[PDB]
Amino acid sequence: PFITVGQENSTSIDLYYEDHGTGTPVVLIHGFPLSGHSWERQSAALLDAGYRVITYDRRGFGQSSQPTTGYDYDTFAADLNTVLETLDLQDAVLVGFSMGTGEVARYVSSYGTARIAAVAFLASLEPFLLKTDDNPDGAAPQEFFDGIVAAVKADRYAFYTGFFNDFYNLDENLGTRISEEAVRNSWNTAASGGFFAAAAAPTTWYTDFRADIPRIDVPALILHGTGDRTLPIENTARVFHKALPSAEYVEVEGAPHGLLWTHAEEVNTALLAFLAKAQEAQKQKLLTEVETYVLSIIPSGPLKAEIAQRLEDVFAGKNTDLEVLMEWLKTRPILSPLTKGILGFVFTLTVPSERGLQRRRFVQNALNGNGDPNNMDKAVKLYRKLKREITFHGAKEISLSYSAGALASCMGLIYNRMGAVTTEVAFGLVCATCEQIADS
Amino acid sequence: PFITVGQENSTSIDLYYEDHGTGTPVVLIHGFPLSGHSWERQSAALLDAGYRVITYDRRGFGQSSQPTTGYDYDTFAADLNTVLETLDLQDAVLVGFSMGTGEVARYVSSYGTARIAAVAFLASLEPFLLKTDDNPDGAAPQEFFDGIVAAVKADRYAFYTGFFNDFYNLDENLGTRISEEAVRNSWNTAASGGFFAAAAAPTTWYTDFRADIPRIDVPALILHGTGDRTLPIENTARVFHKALPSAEYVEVEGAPHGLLWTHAEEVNTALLAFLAKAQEAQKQKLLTEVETYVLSIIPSGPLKAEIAQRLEDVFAGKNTDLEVLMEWLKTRPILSPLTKGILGFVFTLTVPSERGLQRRRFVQNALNGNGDPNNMDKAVKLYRKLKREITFHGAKEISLSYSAGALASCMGLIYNRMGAVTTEVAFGLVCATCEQIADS
Amino acid sequence: PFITVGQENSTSIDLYYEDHGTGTPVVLIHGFPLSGHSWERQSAALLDAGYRVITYDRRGFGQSSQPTTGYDYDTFAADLNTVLETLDLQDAVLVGFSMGTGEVARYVSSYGTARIAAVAFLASLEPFLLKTDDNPDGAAPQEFFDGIVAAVKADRYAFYTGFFNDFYNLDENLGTRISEEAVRNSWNTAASGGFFAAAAAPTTWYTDFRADIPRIDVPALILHGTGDRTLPIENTARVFHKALPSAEYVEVEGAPHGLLWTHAEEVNTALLAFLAKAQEAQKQKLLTEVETYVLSIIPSGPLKAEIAQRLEDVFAGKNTDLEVLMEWLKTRPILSPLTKGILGFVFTLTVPSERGLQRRRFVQNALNGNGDPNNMDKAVKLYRKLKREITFHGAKEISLSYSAGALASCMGLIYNRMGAVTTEVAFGLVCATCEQIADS
Amino acid sequence: PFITVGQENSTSIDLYYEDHGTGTPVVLIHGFPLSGHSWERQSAALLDAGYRVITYDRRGFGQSSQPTTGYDYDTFAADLNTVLETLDLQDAVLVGFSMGTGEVARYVSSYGTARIAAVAFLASLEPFLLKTDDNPDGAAPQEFFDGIVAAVKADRYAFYTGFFNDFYNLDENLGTRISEEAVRNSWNTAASGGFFAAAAAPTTWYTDFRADIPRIDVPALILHGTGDRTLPIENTARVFHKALPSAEYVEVEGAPHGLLWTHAEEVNTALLAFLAKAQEAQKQKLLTEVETYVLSIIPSGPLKAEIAQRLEDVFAGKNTDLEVLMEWLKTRPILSPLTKGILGFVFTLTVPSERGLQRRRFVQNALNGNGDPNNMDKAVKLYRKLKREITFHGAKEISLSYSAGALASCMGLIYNRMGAVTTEVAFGLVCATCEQIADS
To answer: Which catalytic residues are annotated (chains A, B, C, D)?
Structure first.
């Protein structure tokens, strides 16, 4: 599979990518000089955990096009933007390794965390590798990196051998954490890359990400091996943690630069933990917002408390019966039809096991709103806008511009299944609907 | 330029008007029997002082329509209301002369000081010209004004000659403070007016503004010449000052009624001083808005404090070096390129003595907007809209509809001098650019 | 990237190719049993020397289709013809290695040197490898080649090792001029080829090119290693030189057959020298055309002569200074502002050391186009088209469709750094603006 | 009548203009501080001579809008460009006076002589009024012009009195060549202008037109009075004549600056002469092209000679009877219907006194294009393109892309009056029609 990110002369620039599994999108950005297939140990684990795994090969690496231009992090991040937009990924998590951390930092800084839910940095370059006067926390001076470029240009194939020796810490890990054959494959992948890209890549390593770091607002994870030879822990992760103290910090003892394979077990554990925790963290903050908004329209009393209880139960994951819940709603004495309708919409939306209940009439009759053609006109116009929308805060603001009558019908469109919007947006709509009703 | 204020038979009633310069709006309302062009000496001074000068001709006067109806201050004030609402002026200053003072008093009283920041009364009619029992401070009785009307009806053209004799105090001022040609022009303007309006106007002079005066809440200025023959100082301004003691009172010694031309230097000085207090007040509120918006994108730290200080300094007029500031900006390690670009744009825009400093490379590369032809296209579409715009709030609103990428490139258009927008509009753009960045 | 050269059954026959860099087209035709990537040491050098490098994989080799037909030099040359015509290459240089030398000879003979500027033969097969009665200068008889084919059919994978043993002269060069990993990669590339193509290829080696040689009219270079085991110097290059005495003859002492890698330094040197003669020749015709176009806008006089001289100086590389030239331009009285802008653009473009000179104001104001949004809109539309373009003629042709006003603004976009186009394209634009201005 | 040339704040910038008479367009650009009505002596004469007279008032002058921006010759020329394009003038003559000469020079330089047939400079500013080191032929230094501006600002009305004293050389010419009332009117016109424009205009006088002069390729006329006090002959016209030696030079002895009125007879004579010569000159070069193309389709013989003679006669102005010509054509042997059709089209187009002859049956049936709907479709598509076209050379090229059958029908559309194209474009079509037929 390929995604076109540019054009070089008579040829086009396409990136090889892979899209597997169903769930929240997790983008895995490989490091030098490998490819997307490097994540296979992580990829295997993430697929088991019910995630949607997306991997791609950087330009001039793996199966991607090998142009002789655009080897800078502004172009690398631009490519990632194209990738995310082409696939239309929403609420996705970016995971970068080695060079890949640079792409994450730069994209977030330059394009914003709109589509991004969280970020993870494994074996990061950040904040600045170059050792200069203003940056004494650099790993090595300019002259050093110039040596690497010249080394690759001398003989890239022979370079790869020496490269992977410190990439995996073979003197320690060979025959224990990484096999001879596994290394052999990595070398093949390296050779498969572009000759130009090979020597062009090291110049990108001393990129100054210090300006990109503050723009990271989504939950972050910083992971790094102490036995990292290529990128020394202290010149990278340790100072990176000072720049981003909010980030979850993980130090894997004795892990080499290539810990994705060698210490895969420690990596998976740490990553899957961070992902599951950050997911439930944003689920709770979303559901508590929905609760307060829905309860805002319900009049204070013993009924309000009962509703609050059943809402908490389904939000907590306590598999309640839906036929019973709906029969309970239908039979309520002081609740207004619209209130019952909104509640009916919210319960079907949040309940995982629909159990087999056909779209109830009492909910449908509540949301239609007299079946005014004036109301259904604004409802489709709003529906068009919500299809493009993804953020909850984004979906709520644009919906607020519409009247309470138009909003109710819009909810009815979705309920009847004449509409296909994401849950975050659907919650945006219902919260906006509740807000208008509360002010009436 | 015209503004429709009514309708008379098959024809409509339009008022000729002029809108010049950029800044706080200053509306100049002419007197009898001239036109907006009478302010030309004031307009010249006000334009130099960076104001937005708006003048219009009263119905049946100058280039305005000449209907045979609506010659009362309730209609005159209604016309002014239409003018202010059509142009949507906000925080504007009303300046009236002779008859024009009546419009100011009545509009403020009848329509409220919502759009008005301050008011000025030059050669005022207020509070009441008619000499009666209840008003002994009147200048002349009913019978007198009936004489003027009958005099105009006899021969308005011959009337104009005798009128300007006391309007300018020609025995004193002719050949000294006003030339023969200047008077000639004034006469032409008078003759150019409506025959009906000419004789209808004097009846409006004895209007009772005594009830309108207390309704003046905005800061006021009362100016009047002691040598005023048309409107005697003691029957007008002096008693007006007792009715409005809060007002700034200025008495120009030996000045006649048409002091706008003869004693233009004394008038301008006094007026610009009174105006400057209200103008500097609105300039700061504009700069504090820009400051908060610009600081919104800068990440918290010691650097944020440093920028805010340097911003306050240039806004205050503390002539800071620009070559130094730009080199300081260029060399910051944690500032994003876009951030450096925006600040650079702001500094060149706010710093007076640009000192012939060539368009910095680092700012141009920040504002280029990744040289996306799609981003560059949207920027021009926005530039077309901003070329028409004049207000800061108006420029900010329409800019918000564009993406952050499109906005940055549009700023680049202006910075590179491929675009020509007013400073108020330019600030609207930069503030809109900051708002998008803050939301990511 | 692929180019369809034929069709075999249900599938089509596509050749993998690569197009890098901007300048004179240099087509590199690889030998047996490798691929286009073999040129990587030459390609790297050629890109530095400002050439446009075009490489492709022969059918059944590398990433190209692997059909079981068309393994003859009439088909091989037909394929090259398709490649050249598809890319529409003009004034290009053909460089062949081993088998690749045959394609050059055959194409030139069969299709003519219309698109070709010069040709290069490295480790040539020419004129005739087969040892017969009429050709005693053959390297080996028919039976020998039958042995190779049968050897490949036995086990192609085991064959490759023994092949590369004499291809690189490993007993001498291994560990000195070629590393184990480099050979390893070559083997992988070999295995990656088609099984049929592998055994079909040797039969093409004893092709009689003796009739094709006289048809070479473009300047030729003959390079060969004396230590060549695969193609013995005396049976190949030496007799080839007798057949083509006009050709530039280079003998690399002790170089093996695969000298492209082992003696890459000697090869690059020799090749770039020969290429420089052909490159500089059409380079001058490019600058001479630009000169005539630019001078077309300058009004005749002593100033016109002065400009022409300074243009010739910068084209020769003597002048080198830019700030003085720009100051000289700025102060000229007969030059239209647009003319000053165009010349300033050309000078910054042609002067090698732009130094630390900020983009001059007088050039920006000339190219700004008055800040008409309509000129800016057409300018962006033109700019996207120029981003795709590569040729000088291609850039000039598409630019001529735009108005002089739109063109000037387009130049302004690039000058201001809101645009990124190649020098050949940049010159196309300048000539097009000059053509329009001269025609206005 | 007004033409919108810009926008200032809430108001738009419109220029007052007048379009009188029928024939080739002669644009008259007034000087400071008057208006288009100043040309009345020329306009009356030009209308008698059967020309199309176009006059307009400069911004801030006469009946035009009075903005406070854009008082520079780049803006003045931009305005003129709008005027010419809005009216879609082609083959027009530009005539400038005082300030008006600057507009002519700048437009020609900046926009090209596409729509321009010839140019005239009366009482010119050119080439450079400012007296500096680089320009010793200047009239006065910078400080001098600064005095003029301050004089206008002092008292705009009183300034005019002294201005017209030297403008007309009243000590000499008053009561002889100019009446008291005429000057009075000039003063009124002066007062009618904008207060801002009045003082803004003098700064434009020291504009450097030296760079604009060489771009003048159309036939030129330089007229100037020796007794010119405002613009001394030696500092203006005399040095202008050296810069433009090709121009027809006329020196009116003893004429003042405002010679347009005083020496109107001498001015008209010289002007009408220059126009008549330039008019017949452009007729001959165009008609001889039409002649050769039309004769190309007529078969060689005595008939071909007869046609050429009658063509030369009508082109020369020997208005032959059209009823006779058409009957001569109709009853003529050996002439093909299409040939008769083409000639019939040409004769009705070139013959002045149309006499009142109906679109002949023999012409319509020739032009019908057999009644093919495909031919009628292509004819309309071409007609759309020709409506946009203006040049004769431009019209022929785009028409050549269409088939001879489609071209014939397109001519038929115009002849039947279902189409409205200019004569120059109309000639382009017929020549293109002849060219396709000629190749058969």
So the answer is: 98, 228, 257
Q: What is the DSSP letter of A417?
A: T
Whether A398 and A385 have beta carbons less than 8 Å apart is answered as yes
Query: Is D59 an interface residue toward B (CB < 8 Å)?
Result: no
- Are both B106 and B192 inside the same structural domain? yes
Domain residues for the domain of C392 are 367-440
Q: What share of chain C is helix, strand, coil (3-state, %, to 5)?
A: 55, 10, 35
Q: What number of CA atoms fall less than 13 Å from residue A12's CA on the CB side?
A: 9
CA B162, CA A289: separation in Å to the nearest integer? 79
Tell me the Ramachandran region of residue B84: left when phi exceeds 0, alpha when psi lies from -120 to 50, beta otherwise.
Answer: alpha
Residue B361 to residue C358, Cβ atoms within 8 A: yes
Which residue in C20, C185, C188 is closest to A68 by CB distance?
C20
Resolution, expressed in angstroms to one decimal:
3.5
Q: Choose one of D279, D305, D323: the last residue of a domain.
A: D279
Q: Which of D67, D157, D188 sits opposite B182 (nearest CB)?
A: D157
Nearest-neighbour CA in chain B from C1: distance (Å):
24
Segments in B244-263 forming alpha helices (H): 259-262
Domain end (from D328, D344, D366): D366
Q: Are C210 and C127 in contact (CB under 8 A)?
A: yes
Residues of B taking part in catalysis: 98, 228, 257
Longest dimension (CA), chain B: 83
Is C in contact with B (3 or more beta carbon pairs below 8 Å)? yes
**Tokens read off for D257:** 């600056």
Cβ atoms B76, B106 nearer than 8 A: yes
Q: Which residues of D are catalytic?
A: 98, 228, 257
Asked if residue A9 and residue A144 are part of one domain, the reply reads yes
- Cα distances (Å, whole numbers) of residue C366 to A175, A381, B414, C363: 69, 47, 15, 5
Same domain, A268 and A308: no
Phi, psi of D39 (to 5 degrees): -75, -5
Structural domains counted in chain D: 3
Q: How far apart are CA C153 and CA C198, in angstroms?
A: 8
Q: How far apart are CA D425 and CA D95, in angstroms?
A: 24
Of A100, A96, A115, A107, nearest to A74 by C-alpha is A107
Q: Which of D429, D20, D93 is nearest to D420 (CA)?
A: D429
Closest CA to D93 of D64, D55, D123, D59: D55
The reply to whether A228 belongs to the active site is yes
Q: Which residues contact D31 (CB under 8 A, 6 or more apart)?
A: D38, D96, D97, D98, D99, D100, D123
| Beta bridge mates, D220 | D119
Cα C127 off chain centre by = 25
Q: 3-class DSSP state for residue A88?
A: coil
Q: Are the C-beta atoms of A408 and A376 separated by less than 8 Å?
A: no
Chains B and A touch (3+ CB pairs under 8 A): yes
> What residues have CB less than 8 Å from B257, skipping those under 6 apart?
B98, B123, B166, B167, B168, B169, B225, B228, B229, B230, B231
**Secondary element (H or E) of residue A11:** strand A11-20
CA pair distance D50, D45, nearest whole angstrom: 9
Beta bridge partners of A93: A26, A118
Query: Which residue, A75, A84, A73, is CA-closest to A26?
Result: A84
Q: What is the CATH number of the domain that holds D335?
A: 1.20.91.10
Block residue for tokens 């620009």: B322
Are the beta carbons of A44 and A201 closer than 8 angstroms?
A: no
User: In the structure encoding, which two tokens stand for residue B9, read together?
Assistant: 């038979």
Experimental technique used?
X-ray
Residues in contact with A170: Cβ distance below 8 Å, sequence separation at least 6, in sequence order: A164, A178, A183
Beta bridge partners of D130: D140
